Structure formats: C-alpha cells, structure tokens
Design a binder for this molecule. Sequence first.
Ligand code: NI
Lengths: 242, 713
Amino acid sequence: PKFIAVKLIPKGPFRDIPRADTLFGAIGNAISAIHGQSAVEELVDAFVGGARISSAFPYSGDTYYLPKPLSVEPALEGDEEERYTTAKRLRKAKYLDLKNFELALRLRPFTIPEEIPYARVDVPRFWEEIRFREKSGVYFLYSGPREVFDGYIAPAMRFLGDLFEVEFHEMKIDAPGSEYSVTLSNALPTKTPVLWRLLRKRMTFIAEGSIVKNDPGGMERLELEVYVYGLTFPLGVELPEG
Amino acid sequence: MEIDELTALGGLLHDIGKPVQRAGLYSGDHSTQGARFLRDLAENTGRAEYELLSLFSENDELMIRRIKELSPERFGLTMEDVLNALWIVYEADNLASPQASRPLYSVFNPGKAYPWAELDFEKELPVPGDVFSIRSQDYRELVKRLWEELSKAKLRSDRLLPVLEKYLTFVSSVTSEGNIISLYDHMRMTSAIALAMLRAGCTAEDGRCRKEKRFLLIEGDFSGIQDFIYRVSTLKYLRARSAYLELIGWDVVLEILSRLGLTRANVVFNAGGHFMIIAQNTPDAVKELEEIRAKAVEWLYREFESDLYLAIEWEPVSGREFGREGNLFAEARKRLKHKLTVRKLKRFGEIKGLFENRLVSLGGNLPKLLGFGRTAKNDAGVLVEGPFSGFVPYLQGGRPVGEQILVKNTLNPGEIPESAQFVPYFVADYFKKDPKGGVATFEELSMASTGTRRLGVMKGDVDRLGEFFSSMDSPSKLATASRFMDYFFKGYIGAIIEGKFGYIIGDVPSLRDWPEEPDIVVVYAGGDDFFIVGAWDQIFELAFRVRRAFNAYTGGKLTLSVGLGYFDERTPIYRMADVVSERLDTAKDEGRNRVFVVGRSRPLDGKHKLSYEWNHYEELWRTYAPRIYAGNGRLKGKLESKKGLLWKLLEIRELYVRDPNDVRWAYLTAYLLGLSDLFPELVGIDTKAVERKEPQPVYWVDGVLKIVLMAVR
Ligand code: NI
C-alpha cells in the first residue's frame, strides 16, 4: 500500500523513540490545546473509523527503516558456522531498510543494516538522549482520508513542532496479499495474535513487528476522559509452515 | 521394592562391572565380574536387594532360574516383571551409547585425556592432556572406596547417583581410543532411557520401543532472565534474584520428575535457565506436562508480570533418534529448538486473561545455610515460594524440612533424614565478605581498586556453544559435554578467583599482586553465560585468568568472548549491565575468541576492531606494560616525572585515528620521546600491516596505556 510519512527533521536531540500510543497521545493533547474535545472525539472516530498511524522509526538521508517482522524468526533456516552467527544477528536485528523489509514480508533472503542512524547516549549528573546522524531523523506513517490529515494530524504535528520540524511525502510499501499482517504500531489485540513480543507500559501492548490475523487493534477509554491508541497498522506478511 | 525403583537402579549399575574388571578382582568379562561384585556386596551389610540388581551385568534358560532362585515375592515383584526390567535395561544401554588402562578422552579435545582423579572442585582443575595408561592398582583403590560408599548408601536413585558421580566420573565408559563419554553419564542416561520405556508401558520387545516414538525430549528455557535479574528499582538484591531463579527452575524440574515418576538421572542438564528431560510418550505424560507448563506460566505472570517467562516444549522421539544413522539425535533436538523459538515468540499465550523483604532476608541470611527444603507452600518458615512448592532454608544446626532437600555444593548427603529425596545443586557464589558478615557492596568493591576508584563489571559467554552441544552423537555424549561445561563455571570459577591453578594459568595482565580474599562478587555464572563485578583492576585480571583456565580446562578447542566495563561506583546496574552486554556482543561480532578491554577511539573505515584477540592483548601487555608500569599502582621510576609522555602518545595515536593512511604520526612520535629506546615499535611504519590491510601497531597501544594510567592515579 501507499502512505503519507510524517518526517520529524530533528532541531536538537530526542529523549526516546515515540511508539504510536504516545505519538497519538501528543497529537491528542495538541488538538485539545488548539481546538479542544469536539475535534479529539472526531480524531478518535476517524481512527476507529479506519485511519491509522505507525510507531516512530529511524531514517537516514533517503533511507527509511522499518521494524523487522517477527515472522522471519522461526523461518531463518529456510555452511554450519555461517548459519549460526548470521542467524543470531538476524534474530537480534530490530530494524531493516525498506528494500529488505519488503523482502522479509515474502520470506525471501534479505540482509541487515550494518549502521543505525541513532545512538543511546546516557549523560550522567541520570537520563539518556538519542543523537541523530546528519539528514537523519525519525518518521511515522499515516494511512486514512486526506481531509483528516490536513484537518487534524498535520496541524497537530506542526503545532507540536514550533524540538523538531515537519516535512512529509508519499511512500509505497510492496506487501504481499495475505490473511496475516505485521503491525507497524504497538497494538492492544482483540484476538490472541500469531507471533509477538509483549511490551509493558499500565497496559500490555504487542510490540511493533508482531503478527496478527485480521486484528484491528482497539482503543481504550478510562478516567484519571483520555483515549489510549492500541490500533494495528497492518501490512501483508507471508508465514512459514509451523 | 517396586518395578519402578528396580529398573532405575538396574540401568544405573548395568556397567558397574567395568571398574572391577580393569582392577582385576574376579577375572571374568565385565558382565560376569559386575554380578559377582553386587552379589558379593549384598551378602555384606546383608542388603538382599543388591543380589537382585546383580542380574543386570549378565536363550534365557539359566536367567529365569537365577531369578526364580531369588524370591521376587520377598521384595514385591513378579518374575515376568524382572524379565522386562532386564530386557529394558539391556536395550537402553544400546540407546544411551580396547584396553584395561586407556583413560577418558576429553569431550572438548578427544586427542587429550584426563589423569585418573576423582571429582573435587577444591583440589585441582581437570586439564585434558597427555594419555597415561591407568594402573590396575588405581582401579582397585577406587573400587574399595566405591565398595565402602555403596555399603552406607540408602539404595534410592537419589543417594546412589552422588557416589557413582563422585568416583566413576573420570573413567572411560568404553576403553577404545578417542572415547568421549564419562562412565557416570552413560550410567545415568541408561537409568533415564530404561525408566522412560517402563513408564511408556512397552515390554517383551527384542523393536517396538526402538522404531516407535515412545520417548519425549522435554526442554524448558527461561526467557527474560536478564530483564528479571537486572533492571531493579543494589548488589545483595541482584544475587538474591539470581539464587531465586535457580529455585524456581528446580521447582518446575522437580515437579516434572515427581509427577511423571522419573528420577534426577532423567535430567540431562539443568543450568543457565535451560533444562532437558528424557521421559515417556504416554498420553498421561503429555496431559501432566501441559498442566505443569500451564500452572507454571500463570504463577510467573501473577508474581512478575511479563518480566520472566518459561517456554516448555517437548518432542515425541523413537529409540533410533537417540543416536547415529546414515545424525538423528542433534536433528531431533533441532526440531525441539524450533518449537521453543515459536513459543518464546508466544510469551504467556498460555494465559487468555492477557488480552482483556523475603529476598532481603535471602541476601542477609545467605552466609550460614547448607540448602533449602521443598515442602508445601503453606508451611512454617517458608522463606520464598515457587510455582508448585515452598522453600524453607536449611541451616547448619537446623533440621531439614520437606519431601526433597536441595543441598548446595556437596554430593555428600550429610545429616538429613533417610526419607528425604536428596537433590545436590552447585553454584558459583564467590563474594567478598565485609567487616560486617554481609557480602560486599558496589562502593566496597569500587574502593579496593588499584588507582582510580571505579567498579569493574565483566560479562562473558562460551563461543558457538550451541554448535558444540549440537555436535554430540548420543545422550551420553551430550550428558558429558553439558555436565563438564557447567562444572567449569559452577565448580572451578570459585577457585580461579581465590588464586588456585596459578601454574596452569601463569602470567596474565595484572596491576596489583593477587589478594588472599579478592574483592570480587559473582552475580550469575553457570553454563556459558557469567556476570562478575568487583574492584575494576581485579575484574580486569580475573577476565584473563578465567580465559586461560578455560583454555586449559578445554582442549584449547573452545573460546570465550568477554565484555569489560569500569564505571563510577554510583552507576545504576541496568546501565552498567547494558554497556558490557553491548561490548560483549561487539567481541562476538568482530569474529569471536576476543575480549573488549576498555572504551576505544578508532577510524570507522570498517578495518579497525575495538575488541582484541585474547593472545594479541596478552602479547601486547607483555611487550609494553613492563616498560612503563612498576606494579602495585606505582609507575616505572624512569617515567615517574615523565608520565605526561603516555598522554602525549594517546594524543599522537588520536592523529592516526583521524587519518589511518597519513604517515604524520611516525614523524611526530620520533621527536616526542627524542628516552628514545622506549616504544621502538610505534616510531616506524609497519609495511606488513600495509600489505595485510591491518591497522598500524599505534592503533592498539591505548588498550594497554589507558589501563596503566587508570592504575597510577
Ligand atoms: Ni556392558
């Protein structure tokens, strides 16, 4: 499918890589600040009604990275002392570039990014930041109607901008047709998923790169009225027999 | 007696005829000579049941009469029973799997072999070496200690394994050349595979229980082990979390043993949060294994959320697949591995409710206890609970409480009740004690460090160990590799830290004289994966000590990779652990067999590695350290007042990092020390390195210089 990728060109160093649940959380707080609830209720209804945002991922120049789909982990074997080493470095790999990502979906042979454009420095006094290489920031994707991006997300991202700046482009991902899909957002599942890594936050999310069979995800409303983004960002993925 | 306990002891002594043949006591084949040993022994102390196990060394005419001769009624067994017990234990000896002097050939290096000595972690480090023909005198002194122990052993599997292990561990199961299997391992693996066929129901088969899938390979792996030990909120707490993950492990292993009617012999290995079990393929077993898996996952979810998991998968297996044809064993472990990697990708899938001070006293009471009792959960003095049973600490004066008694760091049952199942467990628990009886803390360890007060943190790993374990043909091979592997960490690391094996280790990089009570604290060692902390210079030295001994202990045929870090005493653990973990898998990534020694500037041309090949670093410390470092925190008298040079070199080397092809660095060094006769090796342009596209000698100096400078502040 083809997507609008909100690139965050970073005017200074970040504190985290923001997954979709906190991106949505900031987009909501910004809309609340600019417009108020009337829009936030329609921002939610737009998402429930079909629209989606992915987690945040690293980019570098014209190289967009994506989460390695966990579907490749059990299919790796599909030399002795060459199979051991690489197959562990594929199991360790968190991100792939778009070329290898599109190959990973079709369980074809694919390689790993040797260099990653971010670095977790933990400065002592302590916390940590994330230092971006040159023309290297973070992006996230948005699928859904244009009227709602021009309307709600783009103004909220601009407004959030005023630690970074915002440009965006079209972006195609060739994903095979399949009953199974990879979320590019951390999700709150409704069925029990296929393959996954749990993610603790207090909510148990399914991690970016987990595998689902027609799980839309879902949003959860609670009183502390704040909505928590747990929707899937599904892309067609092929599975091995297992 | 019952048919269950009899077959277990059956398989366990089938081949106790081998130690007595080679001693030359009763001058028959080991089959005959092993029967005369037990029937002999039964008569003495007058324990009738040994004369019943004697049949296991030996058209079945005489056998039925030699069994009829013995009252099967006197014990509680049928005759037609004991005939299966013999054929089962006969077949298992095939499934497990020449001169009367050939020693045990090391699993690590089948070209080397062990000197006949008995297992003792205190005494000496086993080193595969030169083949020495074993005397028949030595076997006779062994068999006499064997004799005296089995005299007092309470004839359950639990008391018998510890003496068979003590004595027959460094003994060739078969005396051909390049024979890898230890006797004790081949004994226990038959005692396992035999008992497996019994519970599998099958009988009077002479290939039903051989070409039919009547076995289960069980494997449990913990996932999130580091997420569960590290990532806290102090040192006392951290070891307390390590210890506790050990107990949870046993509690699930012991439960699986208990509820399938198996024995500790069926535990192929259990260390590093990994256990394997051989068992039956009955539908009751698979039911019981899903129950145990289910109840254990939940208990892990309620108590720790998703932090720590337990992936228990098993595979059905035929006798064929217990060894070689056309490899079928390592192939069938490979399909179980697969099943695990999928389950670890399905964390707490076994919980459909998912998608909708004791340990402080376990770190303070630590230095007075012998083990723990495994009672019910609701029981007095229960300190901590696992997913099945409560663990009551067992103090020196105290009385052991429970169905199983886990005893730490002995094979000698000692003063516990006859009716207590005996479960020995070992653990590398070395720690510096404070002036207060409690273990040393991160500031205490950081303060005893030579020069700069930093805390050394070292994280290690055995290289391509999954490959090695996957190379073993048979259960008995796998049993020996795993047992010996685990014993290096759980047994010998305690010693290496104390200073033992000084000869076998020898000259290593060091900054002070080794202390009598070293400022080191093991956090979690055991099979493959170890994590040690202490005074930074003591941790720096320990790193090479452990690597040498391990090189000795192995054929020089297995390698470590170690990640080292020196941090401020007030650094949070998860951050320290996070760094060395990163430095460690840098070491693994730049080829293997390397140590990450210090932080290092480098050109990013894809030609300069941060880690050192061990011998490369060891060769470098030899060359450069004596020229500049006096020892015990002082600098060579000559440089004392010329110390500024060492920084100016580090400054020089940095101008090489900026451009590795520019020659300017060799210009500069020559003026810098022009005494001149120090560092000849860096003033020149190495053209060997230009050919081999290798770095210039200057690129490596920092890994020695920066350490020396850390020790002289
Ligand atoms: Ni035999």
